[PDB]
Ligand binder design. Sequence first.
Ligand SMILES: CC(=O)N[C@@H](CCC(=O)OP(=O)(O)O)C(=O)O
Ligand SMILES: CC(=O)N[C@@H](CCC(=O)OP(=O)(O)O)C(=O)O
Lengths: 258, 258
Amino acid sequence: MMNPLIIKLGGVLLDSEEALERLFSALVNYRESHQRPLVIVHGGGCVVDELMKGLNLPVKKKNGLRVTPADQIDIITGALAGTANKTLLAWAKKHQIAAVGLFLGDGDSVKVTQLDEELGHVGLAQPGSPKLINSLLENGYLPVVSSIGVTDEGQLMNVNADQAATALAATLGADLILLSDVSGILDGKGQRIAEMTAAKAEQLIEQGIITDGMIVKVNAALDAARTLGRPVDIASWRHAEQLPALFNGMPMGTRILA
Amino acid sequence: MMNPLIIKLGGVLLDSEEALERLFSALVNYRESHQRPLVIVHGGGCVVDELMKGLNLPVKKKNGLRVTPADQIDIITGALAGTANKTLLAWAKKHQIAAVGLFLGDGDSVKVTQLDEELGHVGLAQPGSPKLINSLLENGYLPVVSSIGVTDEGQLMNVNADQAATALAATLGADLILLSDVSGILDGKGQRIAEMTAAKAEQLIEQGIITDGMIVKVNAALDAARTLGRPVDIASWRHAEQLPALFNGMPMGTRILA
Ligand SMILES: CC(=O)N[C@@H](CCC(=O)OP(=O)(O)O)C(=O)O
Ligand SMILES: CC(=O)N[C@@H](CCC(=O)OP(=O)(O)O)C(=O)O
């Protein structure tokens, strides 16, 4: 047996039926040979933005962060905790996987407080109780956890999915992979770097090699690893066939140590 | 041995803060004095219609059931499996109740097939597997179950919540209360008929004693009672003082006998 693995799924992946079919095929392949408890954590992003578009609701920001007013946390919760979550559960059912949909508040898995009065219903994640998810994992279910949470007072909160996944990893003593569009960082010679310290990450950045949104992806993993105290992997679905090895603990993307 | 009680919620209740507060206070009151575990099944009431209005989409209802187009099932799933479900989980949290949100597909609790190609993604509920919910109940959680399901082929389905709750009642061997905005059915002497057979209910419909919106509500309870072979209670959430007595087996609304 092994400690659990949290696979966090980013926006672009959820928007792509190709990526989803490759992911769930990968999950089936891995599960045929491997025993490790797996947990999925997901955001939404696109499905939320699509729905705000359709409702002609403006998506505002304060200092580079989203704002979820009282009067739209319910819509956002619908898109994320409902649509995105159940879409994943439908994929699981199609592929014969016994999944169970959760949000952060189920079993107080991840505790959430209000980040900032000015941002409204945006939550800050912290580790919660592992009891519920441990018992689901013990009984052979694959928990699929959305990044909506709830405060102890009963207020719904939209939580950054990377930070939610980090909190849940801490809660369960789990390893963490952040799956998205980046398959792995390459050095100044176009060679995948299998393992990267904070120091080489910081060098590689404004040495000019790590640029654009990749800065944000690497910084997200560094933040997660800094918190967790064990490494966090960045990977993509690109090489479907390597995902099972990735899930088994091999650094097939880029492993961040911080 | 367990004999769980399913309380089905829907309609304008889901939108009434004061009514929800009183309902959850009654749930707590029942739980403090009883070991027998509770389950909630819910529909999407005003939450779905409100989103449809804001999107300016046609609310097409053929007979009892919302025609659910392929291009609307995601949106409806969000409102029902997301917003409605997580609202109730937030109330549960406020009242210190350990609740777990589910939909019909989790643990294959209620199985769903497409009811009619013409209705689009409308599902027909049938009894499924009690394993997941029984384990949750044995471990002290309150399952809160939305009426969205999924076919074996991975297609999301919108299911009538009364029928979904009845299928779950069959699956768990549970008692069933259908809570909605109902009135008392009065006999020829102006007294509420607390308990009646299906035939009696049918007679009273034929003979114009049961009228207006109650015809629909009695027909739902009648079909449920026949399906289950146990009595099914109809009662109003507006009289929250009577709810614990109702949960304790008192026929405070209209009980349709097997
Ligand atoms: C607070 C906040 O901004 N929440 C995000 C949750 C989705 C997300 O984080 O998208 P990823 O799947 O790419 O991580 C949102 O509102 O869209
Ligand atoms: C297929 C179908 O008709 N689904 C229902 C689900 C909700 C429901 O049954 O309404 P309640 O709130 O009164 O429980 C609907 O979309 O209206």
